[PDB]
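Dear support,

We are seeing what looks like truncated structure output for some complexes. This example has three components. We would appreciate it if you could run it in full and send us the complete token output so we can diff it against ours.
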Amino acid sequence: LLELDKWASLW
Amino acid sequence: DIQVTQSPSSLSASVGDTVTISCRTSQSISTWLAWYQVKPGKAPKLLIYTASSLASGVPSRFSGSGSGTDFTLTISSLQSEDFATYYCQQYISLPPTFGLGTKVEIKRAVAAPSVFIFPPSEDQVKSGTVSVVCLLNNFYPREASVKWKVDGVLKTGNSQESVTEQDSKDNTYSLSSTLTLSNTDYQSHNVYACEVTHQGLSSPVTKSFNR
Amino acid sequence: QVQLQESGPGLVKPSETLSVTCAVSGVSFSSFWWGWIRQSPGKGLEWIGTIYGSSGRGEYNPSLKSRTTISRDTSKSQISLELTSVTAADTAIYYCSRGLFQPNGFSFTLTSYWFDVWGPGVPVTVSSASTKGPSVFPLAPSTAALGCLVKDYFPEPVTVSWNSGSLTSGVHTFPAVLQSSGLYSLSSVVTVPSSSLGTQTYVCNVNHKPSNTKVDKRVEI
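Here is the complete output from our reference environment:
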């Protein structure tokens, strides 16, 4: 979920 | 667990000089290095990221370069406001790690220190713990040497040195050396000398007093 | 645009919990990552941890991970650092910051954090020492030096002026050194013409706000 949050932030 | 080694720890320069600051890493970090400016009582400021990308609102004077393990921060034509401390930082992998910093200071003519020794007060004698203060005033560069002598014998330990920042007027440094002693220890010896050495001095200076 | 502002105590006792707060503004708090960085009195900068404004999830420094807890509060647009079981080693200036990251291409991996905005930072000292005012002792002998010894006081700082601030030329007040007792100590000196000695009066004004004590000490020959 951490990596998922990270990528969600950038888009 | 990436270690970051910055150099030099401090460098002296004049306004208009091109200063360079090296940053080495224990292993490759590709291009993921950042540079920061920190002035006393001021919020740290991002200068450069991606090793060479200039952050918004940063002057063109600052420039970064390098990859892998070798990096360099360059400030072309140093300004008065640029005199401060600079940190490098890798972020290829967790955790982010910083260098220990480079303090950019003002270059100045050599100045010998004025030495002064201060015997303890009668008030402090009644305290049971006396302090012997040696003062090195207005000298450049910072590097100096202070030794304490009691009855001709070298007194190591129980000493604490403190150094001021570069003075706003003459860009010199001042240094205090404080020898804290027990009163019984103090009253049992007679002469207290402060030997000072500095490149501005043609010979080691010694200020002393007889209790 | 982005503006940060740290808050927290000044003093924490060992083994207790250190709580500092950071207020962000001028941007969507949920759309970015926020965290804490610190610098010890002589040691370098140290990243503590960073978290996502939306989920509160994030990453901590492995060396502080066990004692660290970085929380969020979407209402105040605010994050907080809870550092448990602190010691003197945790004495530092604590900065709030935004943690930007980048795709470490071409892979679907990401870089770690770099920091584009920092707050002014709040100082925090960890110590078991009690509040105590300083003892002032005079430092006396064409040019001549003299000063005052301000020692055995806690906590920082002490202020030192000469002749109520009317004497500033040649004045030097040294940084405080933390003695082995947990108390601080410094000296303040000033260079003056040796000819004016015996006639001119020199008084150092020592003021220690956190313990009221206001001391004037005349330095004689």
